[PDB]
Amino acid sequence: MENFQKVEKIGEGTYGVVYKARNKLTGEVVALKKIRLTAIREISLLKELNHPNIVKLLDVIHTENKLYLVFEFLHQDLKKFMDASALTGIPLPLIKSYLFQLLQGLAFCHSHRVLHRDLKPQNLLINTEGAIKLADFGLARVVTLWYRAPEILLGCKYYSTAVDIWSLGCIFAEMVTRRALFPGDSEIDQLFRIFRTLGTPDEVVWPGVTSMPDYKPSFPKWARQDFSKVVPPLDEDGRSLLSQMLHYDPNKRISAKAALAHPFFQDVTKPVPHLRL
Numbered sequence: 001m002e003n004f005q006k007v008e009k010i011g012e013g014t015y016g017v018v019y020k021a022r023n024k025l026t027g028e029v030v031a032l033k034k035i036r037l038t039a040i041r042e043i044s045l046l047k048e049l050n051h052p053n054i055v056k057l058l059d060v061i062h063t064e065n066k067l068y069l070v071f072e073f074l075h076q077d078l079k080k081f082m083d084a085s086a087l088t089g090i091p092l093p094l095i096k097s098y099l100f101q102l103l104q105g106l107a108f109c110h111s112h113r114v115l116h117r118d119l120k121p122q123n124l125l126i127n128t129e130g131a132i133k134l135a136d137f138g139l140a141r142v143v144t145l146w147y148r149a150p151e152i153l154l155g156c157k158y159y160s161t162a163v164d165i166w167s168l169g170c171i172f173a174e175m176v177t178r179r180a181l182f183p184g185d186s187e188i189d190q191l192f193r194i195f196r197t198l199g200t201p202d203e204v205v206w207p208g209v210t211s212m213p214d215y216k217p218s219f220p221k222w223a224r225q226d227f228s229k230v231v232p233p234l235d236e237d238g239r240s241l242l243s244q245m246l247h248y249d250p251n252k253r254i255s256a257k258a259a260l261a262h263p264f265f266q267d268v269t270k271p272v273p274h275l276r277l
């Protein structure tokens with residue numbers, strides 16, 4: 001860490017604090033993440049993901065019994081970009097391009113058995129060239145619960161790549177309506193908001209749901225609401241794809257690889273956003 005000079009705090013993370021730092025050995029600008037306290041192992045396995053839509057893990061430093069992660073640095077996150085766009089909204093061509101790219105990102109790591117586990121606007125990074133990238137990637141093992149898949153809230157321990165498709169679905173709708181899809185303040189509140197919109201799940205639409213660890217038969221039975229009310233601006237191509245991203249049953253939920261060929265991406269392009277840094 002004598003080789004790194006701190007410039008400013010970027011944020012505070014579930015397992016370490018993150019700073020914008022300059023590498024004195026290279027004059028390079030980076031995101032430096034210091035971990036709190038089989039790990040160096042899986043982490044040193046993460047430096048192998050190379051893809052245009054994932055933030056590169058540049059180096060792993062293990063000194064004075066502490067662990068630093070050195071990442072490629074980007075200037076802006078999706079959440080700040082959405083806030084700056086709230087009055088007029090993100091243009092559909094740009095929403096679509098960002099969706100297409102995160103799906104390529106997700107399909108790549110998923111084919112290597114890497115899951116993200118905690119996608120949110122705050123860890124999706126953009127540049128002046130019109131690219132978006134996944135950050136804090138494979139690194140799991142007030143929190144925001146808004147993008148948590150229903151299987152996780154019900155206590156499933158052995159969940160699948162489908163959890164990331166669900167989180168991305170929620171972000172896709174948020175970009176389109178300029179409002180959070182399921183803004184829960186607790187796990188039960190989170191769970192009941194998804195139930196009110198998509199209907200309380202049963203054995204019919206989700207075989208096995210009633211025997212998930214945290215499922216209770218005393219749950220209120222709300223009916224499913226019409227989809228055209230959930231994301232009104234969205235055309236039917238987009239709405240059909242959103243619904244496949246939001247299937248209750250993780251096995252029925254569309255894969256990133258299949259989502260890429262969906263008709264919604266017929267007219268896809270690569271616009272450049274206007275960014276204030």
Ligand SMILES: CN(C)C[C@@H](O)COc1ccc(Nc2cc(Nc3cc(C(F)(F)F)ccc3F)ncn2)cc1
Nearest residue numbers: 010011012013018031071072073074075077122123135
């Ligand atoms: C606008 N400023 C005033 C306020 C904030 O939005 C400050 O926003 C910024 C400013 C710059 C960046 N750039 C990054 C961030 C990053 N990792 C990362 C770490 C965390 C965590 F949890 F570790 F902190 C959360 C999300 C992450 F993407 N890797 C490369 N570049 C990100 C957000």
